[PDB]
Amino acid sequence: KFNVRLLTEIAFMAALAFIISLIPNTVYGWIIVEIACIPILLLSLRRGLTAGLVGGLIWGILSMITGHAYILSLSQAFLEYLVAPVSLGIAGLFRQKTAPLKLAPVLLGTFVAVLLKYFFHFIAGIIFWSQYAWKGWGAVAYSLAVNGISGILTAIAAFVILIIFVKKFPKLFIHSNY
Numbered sequence: 121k122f123n124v125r126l127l128t129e130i131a132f133m134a135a136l137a138f139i140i141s142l143i144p145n146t147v148y149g150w151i152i153v154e155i156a157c158i159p160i161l162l163l164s165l166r167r168g169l170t171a172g173l174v175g176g177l178i179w180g181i182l183s184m185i186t187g188h189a190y191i192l193s194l195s196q197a198f199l200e201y202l203v204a205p206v207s208l209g210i211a212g213l214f215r216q217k218t219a220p221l222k223l224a225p226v227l228l229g230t231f232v233a234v235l236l237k238y239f240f241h242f243i244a245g246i247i248f249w250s251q252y253a254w255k256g257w258g259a260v261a262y263s264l265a266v267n268g269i270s271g272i273l274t275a276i277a278a279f280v281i282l283i284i285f286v287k288k289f290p291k292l293f294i295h296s297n298y
């Protein structure tokens with residue numbers, strides 16, 4: 121019914137995030153453009169918070185069980201491959217249920233959710249990845265740069281794609297019965 125439709129959409133966007141995560145996205149070392157965020161963001165914005173959290177969760181789990189996650193420790197895996205991708209669901213708080221679709225909430229929702237995801241990577245960068253800190257850099261400054269810049273680039277890409285979607289396919293962002 122409504123729920124079968126909702127569950128299928130969650131599953132498809134999680135599998136799509138995963139499939140897109142296979143596209144090489146490295147800019148320089150762990151500075152990356154995470155375009156794989158976008159189907160979770162779209163899902164969160166169309167179907168709301170809970171749907172998005174769960175899509176994030178399923179994507180994280182696929183990353184791990186398929187071997188495509190970089191795992192250093194249990195707690196680090198939990199932080200970066202469960203919490204971080206789930207955290208994209210916060211975009212669901214900016215869902216629009218009624219037309220016309222406004223651009224500003226799409227962009228606010230995306231910004232806040234990518235920010236929150238890369239805030240957890242930033243925290244992880246400090247805790248788990250400091251042995252890789254560039255010559256002359258403190259851990260915090262190194263994680264801030266790497267994850268600050270990845271966050272920004274990820275949001276740029278998420279904005280380019282979702283802006284195109286808002287202008288050419290606005291109904292993607294408004295769930296409709298019927």
Ligand SMILES: CCCCCCCCCO[C@@H]1O[C@H](CO)[C@@H](O)[C@H](O)[C@H]1O
Binds near residue numbers: 181184185187
């Ligand atoms: C499924 C819900 C949450 C549980 C997540 C389970 C995924 C655990 C996967 O572990 C990792 O798998 C890699 C190869 O599979 C190994 O190379 C790696 O050493 C190991 O750490």
Ligand SMILES: CCCCCCCCCO[C@@H]1O[C@H](CO)[C@@H](O)[C@H](O)[C@H]1O
Binds near residue numbers: 191194197202
């Ligand atoms: C609720 C589950 C959260 C995700 C599950 C994570 C399981 C992956 C655990 O990987 C292993 O953890 C050890 C540290 O404890 C590392 O020494 C080891 O290298 C690593 O391979």
Ligand SMILES: CCCCCCCCCO[C@@H]1O[C@H](CO)[C@@H](O)[C@H](O)[C@H]1O
Binds near residue numbers: 258
């Ligand atoms: C030192 C040679 C390596 C490159 C030199 C320029 C980049 C060095 C990073 O500077 C950063 O500036 C902050 C205060 O200035 C510190 O809090 C931070 O820990 C530090 O890492």
Ligand SMILES: Cc1ncc(Cc2csc(C=O)c2C)c(N)n1
Binds near residue numbers: 245
């Ligand atoms: C310095 C630093 N290097 C690597 C990672 C790990 C990482 C960055 S983005 C991302 C998306 O999955 C992961 C696993 C980190 N947090 N900080």
